[PDB]
Predict the structure of OspA163.
Amino acid sequence: NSVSVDLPGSMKVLVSKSSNADGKYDLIATVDALELSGTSDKNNGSGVLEGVKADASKVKLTISDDLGQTTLEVFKSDGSTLVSKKVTSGGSSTEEKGGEKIITRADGTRLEYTGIKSDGSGKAKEVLKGYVLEGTLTAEKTTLVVKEGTVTLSKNISKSGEVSVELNDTDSSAATKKTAAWNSGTSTLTITVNSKKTKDLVFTSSNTITVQQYDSNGTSLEGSAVEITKLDEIKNALK
């Protein structure tokens, strides 16, 4: 009979084996307790399905033509006002509700934006493996902050998605004050104390942070880089 098709977002759609008199294919899906149905002018599982929850909320599942993306939307009972929207593609998902956007990356790490206001500002949290970074959102950038002593480390995520990192230390003494330089080409923050490099912090494409010390000469790296697994270890890097 029908053919089962796996979809992004851990969903499945059943597509009719052959088309109706208008050339169209029937689509059926079950998401949790909810039955969805629709018709499509393609035979591969793409198209639009609709249903209605027990509380009368309208639901729409939209599957892109090449099956690369799903959009699951919930509306109020007249179907006009959007309540929630979840888009999944490329192994990542974005879930939006009033005042909130949750981005889940393919590796399970998350960006959580909450309390979002009409100027694009809000609270921000990055959920990594082993720890969480907290800060703020503006329409220009996300800023995540770690404080240790008189040092403040700030990880910035541009609106466009570019990562940069900065460090500021209010320490008065030049013998102990930390400064840092950011190398966008290697996503690396190099920390200096008393005119010698002390540590490289690498912000990897796998959404991890590693730390590696320099030799006492301040010019050569020593040992090997260690992946941060808890917030305590970021703080230790800032001492």
